[PDB]
Amino acid sequence: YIYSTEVGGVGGTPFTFMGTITSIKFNWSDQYKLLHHIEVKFINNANIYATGDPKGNHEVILEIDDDETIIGSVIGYKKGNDGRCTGVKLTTSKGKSIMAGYFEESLITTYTGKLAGIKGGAGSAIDRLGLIFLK
Amino acid sequence: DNYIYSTEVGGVGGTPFTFMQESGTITSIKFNWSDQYKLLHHIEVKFINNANIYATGDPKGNHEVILEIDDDETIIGSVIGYKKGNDGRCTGVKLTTSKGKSIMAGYFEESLITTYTGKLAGIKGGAGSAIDRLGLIFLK
Amino acid sequence: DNYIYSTEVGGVGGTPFTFMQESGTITSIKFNWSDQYKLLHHIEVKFINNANIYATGDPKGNHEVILEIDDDETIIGSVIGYKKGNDGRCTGVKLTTSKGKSIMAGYFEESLITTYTGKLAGIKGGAGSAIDRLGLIFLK
Amino acid sequence: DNYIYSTEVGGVGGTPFTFMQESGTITSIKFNWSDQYKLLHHIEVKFINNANIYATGDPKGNHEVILEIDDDETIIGSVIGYKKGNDGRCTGVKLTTSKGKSIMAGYFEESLITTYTGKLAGIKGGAGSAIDRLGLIFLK
Amino acid sequence: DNYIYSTEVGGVGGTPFTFMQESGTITSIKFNWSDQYKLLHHIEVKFINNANIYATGDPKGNHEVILEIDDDETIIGSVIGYKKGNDGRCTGVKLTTSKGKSIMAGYFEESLITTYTGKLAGIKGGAGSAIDRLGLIFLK
Amino acid sequence: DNYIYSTEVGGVGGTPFTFMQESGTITSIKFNWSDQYKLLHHIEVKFINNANIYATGDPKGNHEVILEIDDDETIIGSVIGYKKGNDGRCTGVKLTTSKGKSIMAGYFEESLITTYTGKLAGIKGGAGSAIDRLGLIFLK
Amino acid sequence: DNYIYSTEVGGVGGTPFTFMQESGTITSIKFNWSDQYKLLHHIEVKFINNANIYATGDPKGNHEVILEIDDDETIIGSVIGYKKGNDGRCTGVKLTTSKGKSIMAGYFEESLITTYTGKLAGIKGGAGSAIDRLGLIFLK
């Protein structure tokens, strides 16, 4: 497994969810321009692993075929100890793509391959998010 | 199953519907929608080797689109717009086939899902005044 | 039949027409339409190895387009605009062939169908003042 | 005989013309047109291994375009703009070849035909003040 | 000949020029033009295995462009702008080669020719104050 | 060496830095920059098989970007914006890899370098308040 | 020679320069230019297996660009802007390599040359205050 850089702040409760992700969901707000909540289903598992309070007015879901990889990954975030995740654009190997939240401060173009989990911290909002892939 | 169920999105309201055939694939599908309420209201679905039209929800909407689908043609680009929550609704659908055919009906102002892809084999959900909830279904 | 029938779309009005030949395929097809009423009004259709012009509905409209079609050339992109309902009408047609040839006729302001694809072999429907109803037909 | 005749479009007026060679192909084509009247007025056509210019209609127009055509080069995109009816006229022509060459002449404000495609082998029609009527011609 | 002569376009005025070799192809070519008069005024042409610079017409124009041409590089996109008539002139030239090189010179406000294509092997025409008349020439 | 040193561009000011590892490559890089001063201010760099974060210059800037880089992924498109002269500075960087990944940081209003390409293996330069000077380094 | 000389363009002024090495190729190249005078003013050129910087003309200009060039990377798109005449000057340069790298320097307001393509092996010309005259040079 390959662990992307966790970006955003140091706040909120630790989460680590790690089969392959076969669905992912991003709750976000216009009022605060933050990611607030994430859920993640796995490949042969009905269980929904979730984190942070879904207090936001939009959500998007990306379903992901068994053979489909992420080729284009970007997380928007505010940098610093006092930080937060603000947005995410993902693009797959089949042209599928999702845009969530805002990109007004800092960015990371992450590592690419088959998305295998996420890790970070979450409270009111998503304090910190880093992706995980295969080789 | 020999089948992949997309996430049913929208609300928990209306009457359960499930359209599939023992060895059939969707060969045609229709979406009624309104400008006044920005909702999907009605759906119909024919299948291969079967004249029967399976329908659901009240077609009270002022537009409709139909996609016919060749026997060997797959869905490669699928998106459902919807309002999230227990008290939710479907608002729009874009489909794109494996032959460049594309239909786009509805509004996408709140929430989205980019679904799974393959040979469209049925739909599942709930419907009343409008389409409360919709999830697609594919082969392997 | 050795034939695939597109959904006839539009209303139930006007006189039934059906154009197909024992061993022809459509070689030419014309669409008359108006700006004043935003309707298809008239259609004509020549066939391979046959000089006869098969026509329907009154050509009262201020524009027309013709698509000529090579012997080996297929339809890959077919769309009919229409008003839905028992008291309905066809409003427009975009066709695209397998050589990049394409025609746009009339208006697409209410409802659409993306039809099935193959070698265009005839048309069927009803016509009066205007084209009440149109469905295409292909080989397999 | 070994030839495909596009539909002659436009009116029934002016003097008959038919330009073809026993085993030759058009190697150059010219279109005179006006801004004042938005008509094609004059055409000329040389053929392969033959310096003679076959011409028709009065060149009273303020623009002209010439398409030269390589020996192996085909027309893949052909369109004639025209006013429909017994009382009709040709208004414009777009041609596109198999090397990306293309020419645009005149106006397309009333009616169109997307013609048949292949190696252009002659033209036929009628011409007077202007080009009353034009149909193209191809090999197999 | 082993050669294909594009149509000389423009007027009948000025002194005859013909730039050719028994076995040579243009290696470079230059177009002088003015903004004041919107005409081509002067041309120069080197050839492969010949240090002679062949020129014609008075270079009284305020811009020039040069296209150098690799040994294996062909013209795939050739156009000459010109005023038609006995009393005529060349106004512009766009060339595009087989390596994406291209030059644009002068103006295209009246008439055009899309010429034949191949490896450019000379030019021929008439020139005085300006370039009265220009035609290109290719191999087979 | 086993390397290729791009040109260090910008000024001669600040403290010398050099980040390289004995048989390893940059696996991640970060650029801090400001809107207020239109400068690169700080850089950090992780390497393959090494948890250490090597950094330089004061991160007083209001934006940062990070590029992670797969083990087999190369830089194919590299550009550094900078103010030239003894009293100079780096103002921006665009990088593009062999997987379409790309990052933009800072401003490009004065001077540029399109660098050498291959596997990014370290950076070298000088830094103080800001990044006085930056040059990249690749594997031969 | 085993070398191809681009046409030197611009004026006849300034001191002759010629940069070439017995078996090497340009590995780097730099263009100083001004907004105040819209001229190229200075050029520098490193070569393969040689740290020496060969330069010419006074760098009095407010911008510079550098193109680094991989060992196997060729120029596929080369253009020099210049004022023509005995009293002439170079105003700009666009280069494009065989890896998508490209640089734009100075102004293209009067005259151009699209040069010969291959591996850049040196430059020659004249320079003073500014770059009076520049021609490129390639291998076979």
mmCIF file of C-alpha atoms in Angstrom, chain F residues 5-7 9 76-78 82 84 109-118, chain G residues 27-28 32 46 59 61-70 99 101-103:
data_model
loop_
_atom_site.group_PDB
_atom_site.id
_atom_site.type_symbol
_atom_site.label_atom_id
_atom_site.label_comp_id
_atom_site.label_asym_id
_atom_site.label_seq_id
_atom_site.Cartn_x
_atom_site.Cartn_y
_atom_site.Cartn_z
ATOM 1 C CA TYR F 5 21.957 19.835 -13.371
ATOM 2 C CA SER F 6 19.394 22.302 -14.817
ATOM 3 C CA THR F 7 20.452 25.962 -14.652
ATOM 4 C CA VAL F 9 17.949 30.693 -12.009
ATOM 5 C CA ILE F 76 8.111 15.814 -19.185
ATOM 6 C CA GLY F 77 7.156 19.532 -18.849
ATOM 7 C CA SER F 78 9.157 21.735 -16.461
ATOM 8 C CA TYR F 82 12.084 34.083 -12.015
ATOM 9 C CA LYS F 84 16.863 37.810 -13.588
ATOM 10 C CA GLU F 109 5.544 37.983 -15.377
ATOM 11 C CA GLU F 110 9.371 38.410 -15.987
ATOM 12 C CA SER F 111 11.659 35.505 -17.127
ATOM 13 C CA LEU F 112 11.303 31.714 -17.774
ATOM 14 C CA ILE F 113 13.323 28.552 -18.255
ATOM 15 C CA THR F 114 12.022 25.366 -19.920
ATOM 16 C CA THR F 115 14.298 22.861 -18.243
ATOM 17 C CA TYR F 116 15.669 19.412 -18.966
ATOM 18 C CA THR F 117 13.475 16.349 -18.506
ATOM 19 C CA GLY F 118 13.744 12.879 -16.910
ATOM 20 C CA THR G 27 22.496 21.981 -25.052
ATOM 21 C CA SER G 28 21.205 25.371 -23.867
ATOM 22 C CA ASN G 32 17.522 38.625 -23.810
ATOM 23 C CA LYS G 46 26.131 26.286 -23.883
ATOM 24 C CA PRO G 59 22.049 42.198 -22.495
ATOM 25 C CA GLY G 61 16.790 44.006 -22.124
ATOM 26 C CA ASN G 62 14.200 43.518 -19.314
ATOM 27 C CA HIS G 63 13.252 39.794 -20.062
ATOM 28 C CA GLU G 64 15.191 36.579 -20.856
ATOM 29 C CA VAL G 65 14.169 32.935 -21.615
ATOM 30 C CA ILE G 66 16.276 29.774 -21.552
ATOM 31 C CA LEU G 67 15.575 26.540 -23.408
ATOM 32 C CA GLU G 68 17.426 23.496 -22.141
ATOM 33 C CA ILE G 69 17.470 20.630 -24.711
ATOM 34 C CA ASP G 70 17.735 16.870 -23.968
ATOM 35 C CA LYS G 99 9.033 16.807 -26.636
ATOM 36 C CA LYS G 101 8.844 22.119 -25.034
ATOM 37 C CA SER G 102 8.584 25.651 -26.425
ATOM 38 C CA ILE G 103 9.796 29.283 -25.787
#
